[PDB]
Amino acid sequence: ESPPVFIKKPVDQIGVSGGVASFVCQATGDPKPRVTWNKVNSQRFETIEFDESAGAVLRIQPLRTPRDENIYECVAQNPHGEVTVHAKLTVLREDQLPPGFPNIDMGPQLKVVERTRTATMLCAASGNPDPEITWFKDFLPVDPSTSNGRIKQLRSGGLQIESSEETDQGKYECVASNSAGVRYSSPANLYVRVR
């Protein structure tokens, strides 16, 4: 028996009007905890659950300003306690973007790989400071450590998937972040074919 602890705290997001923002929370505990997001029901606000409902992403798309600017709350619960963490959304207009706001120079493309073959999804971005690239698959952050060793994030920013398996199939997007804000590429699907 043990109460809920967040092993993923959501982080503040500064997005662009028309774009995407995501907040991730995930909680551990015994019994396994259940998490939920909070603040009306909208297609533009989507909750994607994971880890048997002990994790959840709140994904907002397309972003609207100023109406979407808010503090969003993720609450985690089990029979030994209830706990909450917060995160802030700012949304800039296209005409308000500072000079070094992350830019996607070339995004991922549609790809088909044969099962067991290696596959690399490409992403290249620029901005100031130099932007940090992370990857999302089926609206979920990709975690290399659970792949495991099988999947690497390259220095160039590509996602390298060795020994392709059926669960590697899905919709990928790369996300470029820096102190100015966050920018999503267009999505690209990776298909895994037989043999």
Partner 1 sequence: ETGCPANCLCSKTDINCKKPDDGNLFPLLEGQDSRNITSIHIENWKNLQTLNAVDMELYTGLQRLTIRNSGLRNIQPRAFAKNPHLRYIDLSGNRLTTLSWQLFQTLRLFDLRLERNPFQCSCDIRWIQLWQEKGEANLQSQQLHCMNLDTAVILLRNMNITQCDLPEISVSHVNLTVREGENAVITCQGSGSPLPDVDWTVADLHSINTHQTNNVHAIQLTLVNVTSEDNGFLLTCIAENVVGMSQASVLLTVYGT
- Segment interacting with partner 1, rule: CB under 8 A, options 5-13, 36-44, 79-87, 145-153: 36-44
Of 8-16, 40-48, 124-132, 153-161, the segment contacting partner 1 by CB under 8 A is 40-48
The DSSP code for 149 is S
Dmax (CA) for the chain in angstroms is 52
Residue closest to 79 by CA, chosen among 2, 24, 188: 2
* Stretch touching partner 1 by CB under 8 A, among 6-14, 27-35, 64-72, 116-124: 64-72
65 in contact with partner 1 (CB under 8 A): yes
Q: How far is the CB of 42 from partner 1 (least distance, A)?
A: 4
| Binding status of residue 166 toward partner 1 by CB under 8 A | yes
> Taking CB under 8 A as the criterion, which residues in 76-135 touch partner 1?
93, 95, 112
- Cα dist. 179→22, 23, 146, 153, 173 in Å? 16, 16, 28, 21, 20
The verdict on whether omega for the bond into residue 33 sits within 30 degrees of 0, i.e. cis, is no
Dihedral class, residue 29 (left if φ above 0, else alpha if ψ from -120 to 50, else beta)? left
64 in contact with partner 1 (CB under 8 A): yes
Helix (H, G, I), strand (E, B) or coil at 94: helix
Our CB check for partner 1 shows the closer of 146 and 194 to be: 194
CB-wise, 81 or 191, nearer to partner 1? 191
When binding is defined by CB under 8 A, the residue of 66, 81, 98, 129 that contacts partner 1 is: 66
Which residue of 40, 145, 148, 149 would you call a contact of partner 1, by CB under 8 A? 40
CA distance 156 to 125: 9
Please answer whether residues 74 and 10 qualify as being in contact, where contact means their C-beta atoms are separated by less than 8 angstroms. Answer: yes
For residue 34, the one-letter residue type is R
Q: Give the interface with partner 1 as residue ranges (CB under 8 A).
A: 18, 40-44, 46, 62, 64-67, 93, 95, 112, 138, 166, 169-171, 189, 191, 193-194
